[PDB]
């Protein structure tokens, strides 16, 4: 009764139509049965979309009506739902703030699909760069090994080059700074971001590391000091900005609010202190990965900014196929357990 | 009675890293508490001294207590192969909370994990019985030698342990 | 009267000693070990693999382990055993009907005895599936002693399947 993964690996022709356009409803279905596309097929998608990405600006400029998304973390089947909630991207302007890989075990699927959709709708669907779009983190986490189980080290590399073309940010409807992580002590004007060289593995310091890695203060909004940045002891790098730091950048830059993902929210989002000037939340966090890691029991959410109304859509987790840690196989998995219990039995049997 | 205070002198590759004490809640789960106490002293002949933390997952917890197989498959209580689940009165509220690792309900042996975060999805399934009284900073240090698959890069040992 | 033939790594002395433990385990002194006789040991009532071992020790399928079977089965773990022999034993923990092939149902059944209920059947089945797919290098929908060897060879678990 358990559906079984499809042995046939999609072809160029089955993926791309004669005009070169991705057949996303085809793709999407294969991927939900856990199927794969012939390596080249995938590598094409991965490279076609990165070219479009390398061409895009450090700071994108996206006009409402838009649907903003947070971390996706490989939870492919929670993505399929985020789309049923956020609306068909055939008729909707999107923006993912990053972190599509690692943590969940369908990270490549997410990637392939989101990459195929960037190709199909390059002027509507927008993807940014998240902390997890980089060699150093995908080596530690399961994406790399994932890629090698399902595909090859080549595909993994294809991706690594791609990720280097992910826009560092976005200026949405000229009112919001849409980033993954946060602000930089070194990034004071929207111009600064424009000057940064983004095509690289994020540095272990500086504005790009800070774009992707900064976090608001645990007591952001009610901090006991008007100090701006303090080193992030939580990430271990970048910084913890404050409510003042934000309102100073916001004002100087004539911006309304900052919209970022990066941190998990039980409600799948979080509005931070309201700007004294505006009465609108100075900072907004948005998490799109429901029941994170399968145990957080957290709700997911997208942000819909239309008709001058920022509407927070929440959704819950959906079902997805089991997978042992590090895509282990049941023999490697149980052999240690087996080789101990049998040892244990004989040992009690001989000490009779 | 009173709640016992044990300690662990952790060592990284032999090099001493520091000591970690724990307040055992016998006032709630006296049996489990004892089990950990007696294994800390060694007074039943077999114990934690010299054992390692085979599974350290950063931002999650430090799993140790396998003094027989040294990989997570073994270990035993002072009461035999294993003993029942006392109770789930206490819950995992955050860093420092000591609890028992197992292989299903009623399978407490000698394995335990020191939380480094709030792991609530474990409540009702694993037996919470103690907390780090001092040395949290040492536990945080052990986290660095961990990985997302638990495997460590330097052998984190329980060089010496006892009651305070 | 009538010598007993058997193939094993043990010398005459070891065959005698094991000959004594077999008599002690032989409750009804019938010359053959029964499961109830095996289960007479408390440490064994809490082991999900006892019946697998026993059916593996049971070469002539009569539901009992006579002395030849007991000795020769205890011999697979003889320190003197090679690598292959210890995988073979492992391979057998999975091949239930002893046709020399691990099947989709057999891999499921065995695993389930060990995992139990910390995995919905759906979950276990999926990973059993996915395990056979990547390991079925001949496409017969089942694992050969070779394919099995190709997946677990460098784990070196045979070094652990050793008793004295």
């Amino acid at each position: 009764a358990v559906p079984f993964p499809p042995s046939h690996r999609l072809t160029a022709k089955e993926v791309f139509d004669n005009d070169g356009k991705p057949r996303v409803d085809i793709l999407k279905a294969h991927l939900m049965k856990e199927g794969r596309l012939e390596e080249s097929v995938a590598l094409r998608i991965i490279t076609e979309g990165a070219s479009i990405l390398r061409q895009e600006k450090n700071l994108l400029d996206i006009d409402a009506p838009v649907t903003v998304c947070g971390d996706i973390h490989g939870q492919f089947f929670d993505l399929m739902k985020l789309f049923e909630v956020g609306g068909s991207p055939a008729n909707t302007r999107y923006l993912f703030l990053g972190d599509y890989v690692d943590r969940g075990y369908f990270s490549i699927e997410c990637v392939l699909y989101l990459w195929a959709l960037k190709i199909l709708y390059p002027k509507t669907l927008f993807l940014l760069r998240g902390n997890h779009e980089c060699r150093h983190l995908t080596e530690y986490f399961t994406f790399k090994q994932e890629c090698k189980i399902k595909y090859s080290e080549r595909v993994y590399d294809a991706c690594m080059d791609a990720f280097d073309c992910l826009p560092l940010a976005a200026l949405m409807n000229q009112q919001f700074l849409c980033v993954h992580g946060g602000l930089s002590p070194e990034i004071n004007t929207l111009d600064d971001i424009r000057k940064l060289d983004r095509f690289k593995e994020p540095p272990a310091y500086g504005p790009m590391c800070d774009i992707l890695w900064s976090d608001p203060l645990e007591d952001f909004g009610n901090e006991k000091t008007q100090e701006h940045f303090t080193h992030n002891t939580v990430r271990g790098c970048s910084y913890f900005y404050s409510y003042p730091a934000v309102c100073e950048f916001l004002q100087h830059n004539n911006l309304l609010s900052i919209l970022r993902a990066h941190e998990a929210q039980d409600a799948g989002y979080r509005m931070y202190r309201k700007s004294q000037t505006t009465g609108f939340p100075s900072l907004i966090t948005i998490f799109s990965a429901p029941n994170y890691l399968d145990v957080y029991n957290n709700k997911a959410a997208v942000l819909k900014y239309e008709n001058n109304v920022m509407n927070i859509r929440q959704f819950n987790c959906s079902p997805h196929p089991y997978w042992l840690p590090n895509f282990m196989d049941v023999f490697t998995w149980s052999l240690p357990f087996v080789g101990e219990k049998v040892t244990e039995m004989l040992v009690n049997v001989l000490n009779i | 009675m009173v709640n016992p205070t044990v300690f662990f002198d952790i060592a990284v590759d032999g090099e001493p890293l520091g000591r970690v004490s724990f307040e055992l809640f016998a006032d709630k789960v006296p049996k489990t508490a004892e089990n950990f106490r007696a294994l800390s002293t060694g007074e039943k002949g077999f114990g934690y001294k010299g054992s390692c933390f085979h599974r350290i997952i950063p931002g999650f917890m430090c799993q140790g207590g396998d003094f027989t197989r040294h990989n997570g498959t073994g270990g035993k209580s002072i009461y035999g192969e294993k003993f029942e689940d006392e109770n789930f009165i206490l819950k995992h509220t955050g860093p420092g909370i000591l609890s028992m690792a197992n292989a299903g309900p009623n399978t407490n042996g000698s394995q335990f994990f020191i939380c480094t975060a709030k792991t609530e999805w474990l409540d009702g399934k694993h037996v919470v019985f103690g907390k780090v009284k001092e040395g949290m900073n040492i536990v945080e240090a052990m986290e660095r030698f961990g990985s997302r698959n638990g495997k460590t890069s330097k052998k984190i040992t329980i060089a010496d342990c006892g009651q305070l | 009267s009538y010598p007993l033939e058997m193939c094993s790594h043990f010398d005459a002395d070891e065959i005698k000693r094991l000959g004594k433990r077999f008599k002690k385990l032989d409750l009804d002194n019938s010359g053959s070990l029964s499961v109830e006789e095996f289960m007479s040991l408390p440490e064994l009532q809490q082991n999900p693999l006892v019946q697998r071992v026993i059916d593996i020790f049971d070469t002539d399928g009569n539901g009992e382990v006579d002395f030849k079977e007991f000795i020769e089965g205890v011999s697979q773990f003889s320190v003197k055993g090679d690598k292959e022999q210890k995988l073979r034993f492992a391979f057998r923990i999975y091949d239930m009907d002893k046709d020399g092939y691990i099947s989709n149902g057999e891999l499921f059944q065995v695993l389930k005895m060990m995992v139990g209920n910390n995995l919905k059947d759906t979950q276990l089945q999926q990973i059993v599936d996915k395990t056979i797919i990547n390991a079925d290098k001949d496409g017969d929908g089942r694992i050969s002693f070779e394919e099995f060897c190709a997946v677990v060879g460098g784990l070196d678990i045979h070094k652990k399947m050793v008793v004295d």
């Binding site: 890691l293 145990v295 089991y322 997978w323 | 997952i57 694993h126 | -």
Partner: peptide, 11 residues
């Protein structure tokens, strides 16, 4: 996922 077992580590 994030579980603490002794024998059959799960996701």
């Amino acid at each position: 996922x994030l579980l603490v077992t002794a024998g059959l580590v799960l996701a």
